[PDB]
């Protein structure tokens, strides 16, 4: 049960090692993608956003899972730099069209009967 297959990394140490340089690539690209995709957002909000999706799953301990998001996250940086994706495909991450969802208990209660 505990003994299992190393898809790409034995230990969580080399898991971050795969996260590191991929973040470096996912850090370097921002000025060029923002340039040729012809957006309006600034580079810095692109930079701190890259942090944002690097954050939500920064809580798993299984080495296979984390490096599975490594290849998962490896799979859009080229989908962007070879202009395969669209402007609608990277503004999608910049969730903008929806009104701010409710955070306080009062706001949920006012809106409707749904947790």
């Amino acid at each position: 049960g505990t003994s299992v297959k190393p898809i790409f990394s034995r230990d969580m140490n080399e898991a971050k090692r795969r996260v590191r340089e991929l973040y470096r690539a996912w850090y370097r690209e921002v000025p060029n993608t923002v340039h040729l995709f012809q957006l309006d957002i600034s580079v810095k909000q692109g930079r701190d956003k890259v942090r944002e999706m690097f954050m939500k799953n920064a809580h798993v301990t299984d080495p296979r899972v984390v490096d599975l998001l490594v290849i998962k996250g490896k799979m859009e940086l080229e989908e962007t730099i070879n202009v395969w994706k669209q402007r609608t495909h990277i503004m999608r991450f910049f969730h903008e069209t929806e009104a701010p969802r409710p955070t306080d208990f009062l706001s949920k209660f006012y809106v409707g009967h749904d947790p």
Binding site: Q86, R87, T88, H89
Partner: protein
């Protein structure tokens, strides 16, 4: 008076616009081959005065024909954008009309009108060739009942 003169001028523009539109069928699915079927000598759009014209900067009416997916969604809109005015889109088939047979799937936007301002909705799965020919006829009848110059006169 000026109303009569502008009425004739509007009709003069009206007659050509309802007889010289050049459709661009954005071939998507089994609905598209039907539009090529009403290109066959059986129906022959060109006898009405319309020609299948690519380079949608030349076309006037553009026909979505088949299911429309999210992958196809953003490009299809841009085809509508640089399509010069006057521009009209005709919904070919149930899938382009309201998602049709795939209305519940995860990858097709329910109805093409969610992306572009559909002018004529043509039902069918697929709409038989002359049913679309009927829809094109309805387009010219609707084109006949416009008041572009008349509205500007009262503007």
């Amino acid at each position: 008076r000026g109303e009569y003169v502008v009425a004739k001028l509007d009709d003069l523009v009206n007659w050509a616009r309802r007889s010289s539109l050049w459709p661009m069928t954005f071939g998507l699915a089994c609905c598209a081959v039907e539009m090529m079927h009403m290109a066959a000598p059986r129906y022959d759009m060109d006898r009405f005065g319309v020609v299948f014209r690519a380079s949608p900067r030349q076309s006037d009416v553009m026909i979505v024909a088949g299911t429309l997916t999210n992958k196809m969604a953003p490009a299809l809109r841009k085809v509508y954008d640089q399509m010069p005015e006057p521009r009209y889109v005709v919904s070919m088939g149930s899938c382009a009309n309201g998602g049709g047979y795939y209305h519940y799937s995860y990858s097709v936007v329910r109805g093409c009108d969610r992306i572009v301002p559909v002018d004529i909705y043509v039902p069918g799965c697929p709409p038989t060739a002359e049913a679309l020919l009927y829809g094109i006829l309805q387009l010219q009848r609707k084109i006949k009942r416009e008041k572009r110059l008349r509205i500007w006169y009262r503007r």
